[PDB]
RNA sequence: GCCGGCUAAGAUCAAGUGUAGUAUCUGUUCUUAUCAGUUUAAUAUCUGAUUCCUCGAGGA
């Protein structure tokens, strides 16, 4: 029924030496290639023949349609280094809301510029208390951890053992993750000492 | 008649002479006071360890009680208490409480003081005001003139005891020991202040116990303090088998036929498999559109002979029938070791039913699978369901 | 927006997600009340004080 509409495009004839980076390189010239919301793995499909020879034909779906023929008269005809290839509007014969405003915020005009996600806690152990406990520090970091993980993804979590005033860092995926853990450890206790926290 | 409803709710139950949950707190055994308390704190509804806590306490045995953060232990453990003191009231005499409450710190204790005087308002009974690091004269003076419950630290629980200021009598002078945050009171640090506490206490006296996580040696621990405890916790009451995997999924009415089709011919669901309906004829049509679609199926409901559904489990039994059919008769009391995969296309409108149906493949400690489609209209078994994962492990 | 109203006109306090940045969502609550001070262009905000009716309970 949908007659255009179509971000589908069809390369007709590659080189059989055809990897699958080279080929969305080659149709990432010419826009945004529209990927599978699911997942990653942009929507391209290299067909191949009942073994792992190559047929040389491509399938390749874009974002938008302008994409299409932009494709359709600046790839036509023109040779990558050794062969040429034919595109052609793609043939077909016989979660959704979420990713698809991310893909088109893809295309913003947003302001850019601006500034350009570590917070430190301070006061939380001793040196002193881990020299006749060998367990009391994997378990205060281990607390340390399952304190850091409610707030946000904590990429990276070390704690000095021999700093004299209890220096741990916690370094997560995004810094308001980090200011949320350090407004909910500030003034809190921990073990029975005023923890304090700050931002890096 | 729905007695059994309200121990499926999730609340695992262990004793021997348990006495039945209260539905309310107005038919639940309590005074005045403890109900004039509960109307005014804006109590609509118990909570479910509370229901399993306050007729244990009030018949006067001990309770061993575990349950979330923030379920109302407290309340649990004062109401049923005050309503006893309310209704066998007994002499003040000098210097021994009629209840002692133990707390592992000074602000928990402060907050059980102020959770007794909440709930004892309105009348003359003032229990304790008490704290450690505090002046123990005004301590003093303030049980020195009368103290309905004992709510304070065990150090200076000690301390008194040691200094003559408060004590339990051989004869008559407590009749319940609270213990608030048990876990940490049977712990390597509490465990002598706990053991003298429990050790200078009157022979005719319940033992209540609280915590929001138990230990296995903290409950051996707690266990040989008390006489014939009664456990209290969620869930394993008329729970689902954790060896059997559950799983759900939300699909339409009309497409749960096309689930099941593809679970019967993509995945390896179609052979072996027990199928809960909901109605007879619902059940013969699904079994009619499985022999249509080229698989051995058979049924076995009400509105079939007793010969037939003879049969069609012989069938089931010996490998006959791929899959079989059937009613909410067969999915509890029956035994099938070749019923691996349990298909619950129809969800039941009782919680007791879906755990029979879960409990019916994977038993004898071996694994087994579960699939069940909840739809938009059973909206009042998904709490039930999501309880039963909860406790389950799912 | 529809023919003055149907509480989509505002503020706020906790938590989650995420960006270089802006942000997005859930629970909420919203004083239904008075006086004094702070403050605001004015609000706002904050700082303190303040027995009767009905059928053991509820409301004021």
Redesign the pocket.
């Known amino acids: 029924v949908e007659e255009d509409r179509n971000t589908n495009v069809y390369v007709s004839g590659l080189p059989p030496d055809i990897t699958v980076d080279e080929f969305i390189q080659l149709m990432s010239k010419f826009g945004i290639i529209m990927r599978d919301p699911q997942t990653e793995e942009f929507k391209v499909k290299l067909y191949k023949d009942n073994q792992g020879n190559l047929k040389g034909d491509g399938l390749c779906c874009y974002l938008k349609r302008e994409s299409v023929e932009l494709a359709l008269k600046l790839l036509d005809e023109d040779e990558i280094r050794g062969y040429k290839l034919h595109v052609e509007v793609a043939k077909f014969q016989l979660d959704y809301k979420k990713k698809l405003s991310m893909q088109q915020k893809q295309l ?1 005009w ?7 996600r570590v917070v430190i806690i301070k006061n939380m152990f001793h040196p002193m208390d881990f020299e006749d406990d060998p367990l009391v520090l994997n378990e205060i970091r281990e607390d340390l951890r399952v304190e850091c993980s ?4 904590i990429r990276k979590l070390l704690l000095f053992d021999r700093h004299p005033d209890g220096v741990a860092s916690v370094s997560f ?5 980090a ?3 350090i ?2 450890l500030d003034g809190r206790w921990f073990g029975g000492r005023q923890i304090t926290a700050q931002a890096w | 008649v729905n007695v059994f409803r309200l121990e499926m709710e999730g609340i695992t139950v262990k004793g021997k002479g348990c006495p039945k949950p209260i539905k309310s707190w107005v038919q639940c055994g309590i005074s ?1 006071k403890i ?2 308390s509960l ?2 704190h804006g109590y609509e509804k118990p909570t479910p360890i509370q229901t399993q806590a306050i007729p244990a306490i009030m018949s006067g045995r001990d309770l061993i009680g575990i349950a979330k953060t923030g379920s109302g232990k407290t309340i649990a453990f004062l109401l049923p208490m005050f309503r006893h003191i309310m209704d066998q009231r007994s002499l003040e005499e000098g210097e021994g409480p009629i209840a002692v409450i133990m707390t592992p710190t000074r602000e928990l204790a402060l907050q059980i003081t102020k959770e007794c005087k909440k709930f004892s308002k309105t009348l003359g009974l003032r229990v304790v005001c008490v704290y450690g690091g505090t002046g123990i004269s005004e301590q003093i003076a303030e049980l020195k003139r009368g103290a309905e419950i004992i709510v304070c630290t065990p150090g200076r629980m000690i301390d008194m005891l040691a200094a003559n200021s408060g004590r339990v009598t051989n004869l008559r002078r407590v009749t319940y020991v609270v213990l608030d945050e048990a876990d940490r009171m049977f712990d390597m640090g509490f465990e002598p202040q706990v053991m003298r506490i429990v050790d200078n206490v009157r022979p005719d006296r319940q033992t209540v116990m609280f915590s929001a996580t138990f230990p296995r040696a903290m409950e051996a621990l707690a266990r040989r303090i008390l006489s014939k405890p009664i456990e209290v916790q969620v869930g394993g009451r008329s729970v689902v088998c954790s060896d059997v995997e559950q799983q759900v999924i939300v699909i339409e009415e009309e497409k749960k036929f096309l689930k099941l089709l593809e679970l019967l011919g993509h995945y390896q669901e179609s052979g072996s498999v027990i199928i809960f309906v909901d109605k007879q004829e619902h059940a013969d049509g699904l079994l009619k559109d499985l022999m249509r679609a080229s698989y051995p199926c058979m049924s076995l409901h009400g509105g079939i002979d007793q010969y037939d559904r003879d049969s069609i489990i012989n069938d089931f039994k010996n490998g006959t029938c791929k899959l079989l059919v059937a009613t909410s008769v067969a999915a509890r009391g029956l035994d099938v070791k070749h019923l691996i995969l349990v298909v619950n296309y129809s969800c039941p409108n009782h919680y007791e039913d879906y755990v029979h149906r879960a409990g019916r493949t994977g038993r004898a400690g071996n694994k087994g699978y579960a699939y069940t489609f909840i739809t938009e209209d059973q909206a009042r078994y998904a709490g039930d369901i999501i309880k039963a994962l909860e406790l389950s492990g799912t």
């Open positions: 913003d947003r302001p850019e510029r601006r500034a350009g409610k707030f946000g993804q995926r995004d810094p308001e993750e200011d949320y853990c407004q909910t | 005045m109900l004039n109307k005014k």
